Design an enzyme around this catalytic site. Sequence first.
Site, PDB file in Angstrom:
ATOM      1  N   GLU A  35      49.694  38.649  29.692  1.00 28.91           N
ATOM      2  CA  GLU A  35      49.201  39.511  30.768  1.00 28.91           C
ATOM      3  C   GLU A  35      49.729  39.093  32.143  1.00 28.91           C
ATOM      4  O   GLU A  35      50.217  39.928  32.889  1.00 28.91           O
ATOM      5  CB  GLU A  35      47.673  39.537  30.785  1.00 28.91           C
ATOM      6  CG  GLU A  35      47.035  40.234  29.600  1.00 28.91           C
ATOM      7  CD  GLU A  35      47.247  41.737  29.574  1.00 28.91           C
ATOM      8  OE1 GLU A  35      47.827  42.282  30.541  1.00 28.91           O
ATOM      9  OE2 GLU A  35      46.812  42.361  28.572  1.00 28.91           O
ATOM     10  N   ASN A  46      49.565  50.695  37.147  1.00 30.52           N
ATOM     11  CA  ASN A  46      49.620  51.529  35.963  1.00 30.52           C
ATOM     12  C   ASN A  46      50.095  52.915  36.348  1.00 30.52           C
ATOM     13  O   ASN A  46      50.002  53.304  37.504  1.00 30.52           O
ATOM     14  CB  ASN A  46      48.254  51.572  35.282  1.00 30.52           C
ATOM     15  CG  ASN A  46      47.755  50.183  34.917  1.00 30.52           C
ATOM     16  OD1 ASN A  46      48.520  49.368  34.388  1.00 30.52           O
ATOM     17  ND2 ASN A  46      46.485  49.895  35.204  1.00 30.52           N
ATOM     18  N   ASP A  48      48.866  55.836  35.786  1.00 33.22           N
ATOM     19  CA  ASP A  48      47.789  56.677  36.272  1.00 33.22           C
ATOM     20  C   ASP A  48      47.353  56.342  37.694  1.00 33.22           C
ATOM     21  O   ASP A  48      46.524  57.043  38.253  1.00 33.22           O
ATOM     22  CB  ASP A  48      46.578  56.548  35.345  1.00 33.22           C
ATOM     23  CG  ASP A  48      46.184  55.103  35.116  1.00 33.22           C
ATOM     24  OD1 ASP A  48      46.840  54.440  34.285  1.00 33.22           O
ATOM     25  OD2 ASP A  48      45.248  54.643  35.782  1.00 33.22           O
ATOM     26  N   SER A  50      45.929  53.370  38.679  1.00 36.03           N
ATOM     27  CA  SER A  50      45.117  52.158  38.689  1.00 36.03           C
ATOM     28  C   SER A  50      46.026  50.917  38.804  1.00 36.03           C
ATOM     29  O   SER A  50      47.243  51.001  38.675  1.00 36.03           O
ATOM     30  CB  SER A  50      44.233  52.084  37.433  1.00 36.03           C
ATOM     31  OG  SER A  50      44.996  52.101  36.247  1.00 36.03           O
ATOM     32  N   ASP A  52      46.184  46.583  37.656  1.00 31.05           N
ATOM     33  CA  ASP A  52      45.669  45.437  36.898  1.00 31.05           C
ATOM     34  C   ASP A  52      45.723  44.174  37.773  1.00 31.05           C
ATOM     35  O   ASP A  52      46.739  43.921  38.431  1.00 31.05           O
ATOM     36  CB  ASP A  52      46.508  45.206  35.642  1.00 31.05           C
ATOM     37  CG  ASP A  52      46.398  46.319  34.645  1.00 31.05           C
ATOM     38  OD1 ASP A  52      45.462  47.126  34.692  1.00 31.05           O
ATOM     39  OD2 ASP A  52      47.278  46.384  33.762  1.00 31.05           O
ATOM     40  N   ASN A  59      41.641  45.903  34.975  1.00 29.73           N
ATOM     41  CA  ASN A  59      42.134  47.221  35.375  1.00 29.73           C
ATOM     42  C   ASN A  59      41.094  47.889  36.291  1.00 29.73           C
ATOM     43  O   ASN A  59      39.912  47.942  35.962  1.00 29.73           O
ATOM     44  CB  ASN A  59      42.354  48.041  34.093  1.00 29.73           C
ATOM     45  CG  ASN A  59      43.050  49.359  34.322  1.00 29.73           C
ATOM     46  OD1 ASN A  59      43.158  49.852  35.437  1.00 29.73           O
ATOM     47  ND2 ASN A  59      43.527  49.951  33.243  1.00 29.73           N
ATOM     48  N   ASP A 101      32.289  45.402  24.895  1.00 29.33           N
ATOM     49  CA  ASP A 101      32.035  46.849  25.075  1.00 29.33           C
ATOM     50  C   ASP A 101      32.296  47.737  23.850  1.00 29.33           C
ATOM     51  O   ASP A 101      31.956  48.937  23.875  1.00 29.33           O
ATOM     52  CB  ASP A 101      32.861  47.405  26.240  1.00 29.33           C
ATOM     53  CG  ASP A 101      34.345  47.483  25.913  1.00 29.33           C
ATOM     54  OD1 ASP A 101      34.714  47.126  24.766  1.00 29.33           O
ATOM     55  OD2 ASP A 101      35.146  47.873  26.795  1.00 29.33           O
TER      56      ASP A 101
END
Length: 129
Positions: A35, A46, A48, A50, A52, A59, A101
């Site tokens: 990562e 990202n 879209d 967003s 990280d 994110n 989650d």
Amino acid sequence: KVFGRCELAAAMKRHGLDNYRGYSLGNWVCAAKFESNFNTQATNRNTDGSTDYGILQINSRWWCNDGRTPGSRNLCNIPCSALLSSDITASVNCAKKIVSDGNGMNAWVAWRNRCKGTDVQAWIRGCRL
Ligand SMILES: [Cl-]
Ligand SMILES: [Cl-]
Ligand SMILES: [Cl-]
Ligand SMILES: [Cl-]
Ligand SMILES: [Cl-]
Ligand SMILES: [Cl-]
Ligand code: NA
């Protein structure tokens, strides 16, 4: 800060990630390696829109607020910039929420593609834990 491999394993262990939801320490270390290359300052955009943030590339789409990801959530109730500290506490506490989650560590794309099903123990080999 760029952590050493065993330095980070130890930090992660102190913060309760070893076998957290059944994921051995080596999984977490492997995830951080791919990562962020163990760099607490890493940021990546990202498609879209967003971003990280930090050692575990958390994110802004879901987990932290950066004020520039329209429509997103802040489920860890933290500013994304707090995830770039040389102290990994905020990243670890949010990571505990993410991994609990439903999807487990599959939430981290790099974990799934590069760590999952591999000999993750190698990442903590030789480390004083
Ligand atoms: Cl392991
Ligand atoms: Cl936002
Ligand atoms: Cl730390
Ligand atoms: Cl922190
Ligand atoms: Cl799981
Ligand atoms: Cl070992
Ligand atoms: Na957000």
